[PDB]
Amino acid sequence: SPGVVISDDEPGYDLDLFCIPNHYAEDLERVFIPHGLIMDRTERLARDVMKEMGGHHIVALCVLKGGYKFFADLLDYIKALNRNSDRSIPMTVDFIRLKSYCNDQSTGDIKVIGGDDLSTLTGKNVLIVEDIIDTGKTMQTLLSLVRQYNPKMVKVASLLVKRTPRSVGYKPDFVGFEIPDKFVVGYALDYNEYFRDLNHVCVISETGKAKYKA
Amino acid sequence: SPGVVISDDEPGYDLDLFCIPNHYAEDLERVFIPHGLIMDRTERLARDVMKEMGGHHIVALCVLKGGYKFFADLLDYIKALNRNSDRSIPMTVDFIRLKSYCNDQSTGDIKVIGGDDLSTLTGKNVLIVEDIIDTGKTMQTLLSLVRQYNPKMVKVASLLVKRTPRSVGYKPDFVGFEIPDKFVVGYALDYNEYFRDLNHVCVISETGKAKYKA
Amino acid sequence: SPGVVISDDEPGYDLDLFCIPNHYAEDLERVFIPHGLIMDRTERLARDVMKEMGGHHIVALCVLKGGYKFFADLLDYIKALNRNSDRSIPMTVDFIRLKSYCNDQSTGDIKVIGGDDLSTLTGKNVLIVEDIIDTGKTMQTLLSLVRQYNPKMVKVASLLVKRTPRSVGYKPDFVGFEIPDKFVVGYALDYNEYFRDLNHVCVISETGKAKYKA
Amino acid sequence: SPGVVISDDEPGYDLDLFCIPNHYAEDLERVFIPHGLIMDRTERLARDVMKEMGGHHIVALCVLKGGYKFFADLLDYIKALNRNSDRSIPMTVDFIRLKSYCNDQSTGDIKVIGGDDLSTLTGKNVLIVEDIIDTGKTMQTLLSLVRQYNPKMVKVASLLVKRTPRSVGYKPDFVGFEIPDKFVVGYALDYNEYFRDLNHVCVISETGKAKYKA
Ligand SMILES: Nc1nc2c([C@@H]3N[C@H](COP(=O)(O)O)[C@@H](O)[C@H]3O)c[nH]c2c(=O)[nH]1
Ligand SMILES: Nc1nc2c([C@@H]3N[C@H](COP(=O)(O)O)[C@@H](O)[C@H]3O)c[nH]c2c(=O)[nH]1
Ligand SMILES: Nc1nc2c([C@@H]3N[C@H](COP(=O)(O)O)[C@@H](O)[C@H]3O)c[nH]c2c(=O)[nH]1
Ligand SMILES: Nc1nc2c([C@@H]3N[C@H](COP(=O)(O)O)[C@@H](O)[C@H]3O)c[nH]c2c(=O)[nH]1
Ligand SMILES: [Mg+2]
Ligand SMILES: [Mg+2]
Ligand SMILES: [Mg+2]
Ligand SMILES: [Mg+2]
Ligand SMILES: [Mg+2]
Numbered sequence: 092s093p094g095v096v097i098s099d100d101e102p103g104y105d106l107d108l109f110c111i112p113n114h115y116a117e118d119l120e121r122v123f124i125p126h127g128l129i130m131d132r133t134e135r136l137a138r139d140v141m142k143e144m145g146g147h148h149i150v151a152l153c154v155l156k157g158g159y160k161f162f163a164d165l166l167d168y169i170k171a172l173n174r175n176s177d178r179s180i181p182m183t184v185d186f187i188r189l190k191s192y193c194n195d196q197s198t199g200d201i202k203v204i205g206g207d208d209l210s211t212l213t214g215k216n217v218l219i220v221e222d223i224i225d226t227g228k229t230m231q232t233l234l235s236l237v238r239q240y241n242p243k244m245v246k247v248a249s250l251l252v253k254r255t256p257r258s259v260g261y262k263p264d265f266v267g268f269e270i271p272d273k274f275v276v277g278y279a280l281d282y283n284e285y286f287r288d289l290n291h292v293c294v295i296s297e298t299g300k301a302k303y304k305a
Numbered sequence: 306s307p308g309v310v311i312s313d314d315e316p317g318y319d320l321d322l323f324c325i326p327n328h329y330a331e332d333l334e335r336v337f338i339p340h341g342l343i344m345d346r347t348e349r350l351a352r353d354v355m356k357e358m359g360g361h362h363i364v365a366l367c368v369l370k371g372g373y374k375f376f377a378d379l380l381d382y383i384k385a386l387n388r389n390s391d392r393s394i395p396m397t398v399d400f401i402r403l404k405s406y407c408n409d410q411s412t413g414d415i416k417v418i419g420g421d422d423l424s425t426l427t428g429k430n431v432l433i434v435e436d437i438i439d440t441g442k443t444m445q446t447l448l449s450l451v452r453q454y455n456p457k458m459v460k461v462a463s464l465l466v467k468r469t470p471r472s473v474g475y476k477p478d479f480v481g482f483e484i485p486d487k488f489v490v491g492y493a494l495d496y497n498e499y500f501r502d503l504n505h506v507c508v509i510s511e512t513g514k515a516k517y518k519a
Numbered sequence: 520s521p522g523v524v525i526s527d528d529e530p531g532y533d534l535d536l537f538c539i540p541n542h543y544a545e546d547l548e549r550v551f552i553p554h555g556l557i558m559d560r561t562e563r564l565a566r567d568v569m570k571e572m573g574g575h576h577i578v579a580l581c582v583l584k585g586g587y588k589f590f591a592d593l594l595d596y597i598k599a600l601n602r603n604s605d606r607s608i609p610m611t612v613d614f615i616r617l618k619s620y621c622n623d624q625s626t627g628d629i630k631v632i633g634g635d636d637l638s639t640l641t642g643k644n645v646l647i648v649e650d651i652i653d654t655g656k657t658m659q660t661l662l663s664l665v666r667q668y669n670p671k672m673v674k675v676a677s678l679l680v681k682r683t684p685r686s687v688g689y690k691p692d693f694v695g696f697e698i699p700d701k702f703v704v705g706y707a708l709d710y711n712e713y714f715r716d717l718n719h720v721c722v723i724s725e726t727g728k729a730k731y732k733a
Numbered sequence: 734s735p736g737v738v739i740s741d742d743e744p745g746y747d748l749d750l751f752c753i754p755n756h757y758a759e760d761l762e763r764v765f766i767p768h769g770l771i772m773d774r775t776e777r778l779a780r781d782v783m784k785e786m787g788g789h790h791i792v793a794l795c796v797l798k799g800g801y802k803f804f805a806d807l808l809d810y811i812k813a814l815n816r817n818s819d820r821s822i823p824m825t826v827d828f829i830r831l832k833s834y835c836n837d838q839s840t841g842d843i844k845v846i847g848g849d850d851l852s853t854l855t856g857k858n859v860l861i862v863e864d865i866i867d868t869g870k871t872m873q874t875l876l877s878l879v880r881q882y883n884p885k886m887v888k889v890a891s892l893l894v895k896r897t898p899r900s901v902g903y904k905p906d907f908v909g910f911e912i913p914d915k916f917v918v919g920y921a922l923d924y925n926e927y928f929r930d931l932n933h934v935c936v937i938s939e940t941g942k943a944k945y946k947a
């Protein structure tokens with residue numbers, strides 16, 4: 092499945108219809124995926140993960156920085172299931188930071204800003220949690236590093252998957268939303284480190300990208 | 306504003322993409338407004354209410370049974386604002402229950418199944434909290450009833466407003482979502498008492514319509 | 520089980536440690552039961568209910584006005600279980616109002632301000648949801664009324680149970696907290712209709728009792 | 734403010750009163766600080782942070798892995814204030830991983846696994862978010878590292894502060910709870926990587942210590 096498909100027509104929502112930080116209004120064009128919707132979709136994704144890896148101990152690997160919010164929420168929903176059902180996915184949490192984007196584009200060079208503690212993943216079931224699959228370079232690179240160590244199994248959950256001509260074609264195991272070729276921010280996703288402190292996933296305005304341009 | 310407008314050519318979301326009670330699986334067609342989206346819009350509605358009435362003491366009147374969820378959540382968001390800024394809108398709460406629907410049509414006979422404690426509304430600023438304005442008979446009836454007690458002011462917040470030829474033309478002061486002419490259920494809104502125990506506002510299938518038909 | 524037992528020697532927390540509505544600042548003495556603690560306890564109560572009535576269709580009956588918050592939250596947790604497991608407690612909802620308190624004491628006279636439609640309880644499994652059992656007059660009156668309609672089974676859930684000499688000794692099927700003989704407000708529990716718009720269950724100050732005295 | 738002071742003989746709660754992960758049923762002794770209580774305290778902490786640094790651009794620095802849950806939640810509450818008031822603390826978010834514990838013991842040798850990014854802190858207002866101050870060694874080392882790059886200002890928010898003779902005597906700027914000399918787990922706080930996937934802060938059972946010992 093492709094997840095919740097947001098066609099290139101979806102108009103999104105007027106900023107005035109929700110609560111958005113005033114210091115960002117100037118720089119945002121529309122609310123694209125409201126936080127509450129992300130939550131509802133993530134609750135389902137958590138049940139999907141539980142069905143797929145339920146009877147196993149897992150190592151949840153958070154791809155910093157962009158995946159931090161999705162990582163926290165996805166694990167909370169899995170935790171909810173773990174304490175309210177017969178099913179139980181015991182979890183250990185790991186973090187790794189990869190960097191390669193400047194402005195609204197990938198530089199093509201993915202760097203591991205530390206956390207290559209991937210050697211401990213040998214024989215383990217790994218659940219990688221990322222914010223968005225764009226060109227697919229980051230995940231392609233991450234998967235290469237992880238597989239190096241022979242983990243028992245590796246699954247990838249990405250909140251978003253972008254429909255772009257630049258995509259390598261990589262598809263995650265779990266996907267919240269499939270979106271158009273627009274640079275989105277919010278929910279931990281940034282534009283040169285800004286907009287991470289934003290509840291909803293929005294689209295940056297032209298004046299916004301210009302103002303925060305590197 | 307007319308709120309968040311959901312167009313006629315909008316097919317909602319696949320039930321498959323969310324978590325819905327299995328005991329309702331075949332009874333629903335699609336998810337129309339995810340719970341989280343309702344919360345996000347309700348958060349903004351609370352700020353708008355406080356902006357308009359936040360300067361005074363308010364009496365929140367809940368229109369049972371359908372408005373119970375929206376009433377609870379809207380008040381919670383208003384309380385969140387109250388305890389996180391000097392901006393305070395003291396609130397007292399009241400409930401009145403009106404009945405007139407059978408299956409998916411209004412009998413045209415709006416019965417007050419308990420609710421004349423309305424005398425306590427005299428001289429007060431009233432915020433009526435309702436689930437949906439359809440033909441408008443209910444709210445028209447309620448407004449007439451409340452006006453009999455001379456409140457200081459009366460404002461109405463309805464989570465939904467349906468675009469239907471059957472409407473009287475009434476428009477609330479606050480509106481969450483403007484929807485197509487479809488009988489929705491969930492979020493305390495029912496179909497012959499069922500579907501109230503449902504997080505998301507959904508469209509009732511034909512099998513559900515028959516299964517729970519009065 | 521007696522629920523979470525709070526001893527007579529427990530004073531609660533300084534108002535300074537939490538966020539509380541500014542308009543009630545001087546009217547409250549201490550935070551007695553943090554909202555989040557109520558939520559955590561309610562979550563287990565929802566699992567307990569599911570374990571006792573899960574195999575059946577239930578009619579949740581809300582005792583207005585004080586039980587409205589506990590009713591909304593308990594049902595929300597029950598719903599959460601319902602959409603994340605084959606275990607499904609399908610439920611319909613009803614509301615009933617019982618008035619008898621003036622200031623911080625019962626007036627003896629218990630008026631059932633709306634409740635002829637309890638006939639819908641006939642032959643069904645009922646879950647009564649109430650805020651607090653004090654003298655026991657209210658619940659006693661309610662149980663008698665409901666029995667008149669011959670329901671299949673009745674179970675009561677009370678957020679609080681007060682340790683007081685005035686109590687008749689009634690014990691609910693589910694209890695959140697067993698508290699000392701103090702007049703608490705907040706979480707929908709009032710003092711002459713005030714303090715319902717309060718997240719935490721708190722103890723009133725003498726100034727609050729005096730200022731809102733009736 | 735010294736935060737919520739938890740007494741030496743604090744009993745905590747029977748696990749049977751809350752919902753805990755099945756895989757930890759025999760590994761915990763008591764629920765020490767309920768998740769909901771942590772949330773309530775964190776809400777106030779966010780308002781306190783906003784009161785002290787609300788008029789400026791702040792860099793929130795998460796001390797991994799322990800402070801990941803507190804960091805997410807504290808920032809979420811700050812964001813809630815940011816999108817609902819005139820005051821806005823635009824935040825950028827950074828992470829730094831420090832490691833020094835084995836079982837329930839501090840090796841005294843702190844390792845900086847990833848965070849050199851600290852050069853970007855020059856002339857910025859830094860809010861360090863940590864899980865707990867025990868011996869004080871970790872925060873001591875961190876402030877030294879951060880201060881090396883001349884930040885405009887640095888404040889420390891620690892969810893917990895342990896009363897221990899081993900303590901150096903460091904006092905954070907914001908403190909959630911001051912606890913007795915016990916090795917707590919949960920809410921991202923681990924015991925050899927275990928117990929992070931647990932919502933409540935609990936005390937470890939004797940069987941848990943032996944099963945998860947390093
Ligand atoms: N805010 C915001 N970040 C990204 C990214 C960042 N780049 C990475 C994915 O890149 P790629 O697939 O191109 O290798 C992710 O880790 C993500 O954080 C890609 N597309 C967007 C986008 O549209 N918006
Ligand atoms: N579940 C579900 N309830 C209603 C109602 C109920 N009828 C009332 C509004 O009716 P009207 O405007 O026609 O008088 C509301 O109180 C609402 O509870 C109208 N339309 C719908 C609908 O599409 N779905
Ligand atoms: N706010 C606040 N309400 C009540 C009540 C109200 N009275 C009813 C119970 O009364 P009784 O058992 O005494 O007959 C409940 O419906 C409850 O709402 C009792 N004690 C308190 C209290 O300490 N505080
Ligand atoms: N789970 C759990 N972790 C810690 C720690 C970890 N050690 C660090 C603080 O140690 P110190 O002050 O001794 O240097 C923190 O980063 C914290 O994660 C100290 N005490 C406890 C405790 O009681 N429980
Ligand atoms: Mg990234
Ligand atoms: Mg980025
Ligand atoms: Mg109605
Ligand atoms: Mg109805
Ligand atoms: Mg009552």
Ligand SMILES: [Mg+2]
Nearest residue numbers: 585620708709
């Ligand atoms: Mg009362």
Ligand SMILES: [Mg+2]
Nearest residue numbers: 797798799800
């Ligand atoms: Mg640590």
Ligand SMILES: [Mg+2]
Nearest residue numbers: 799834923924
């Ligand atoms: Mg640790």
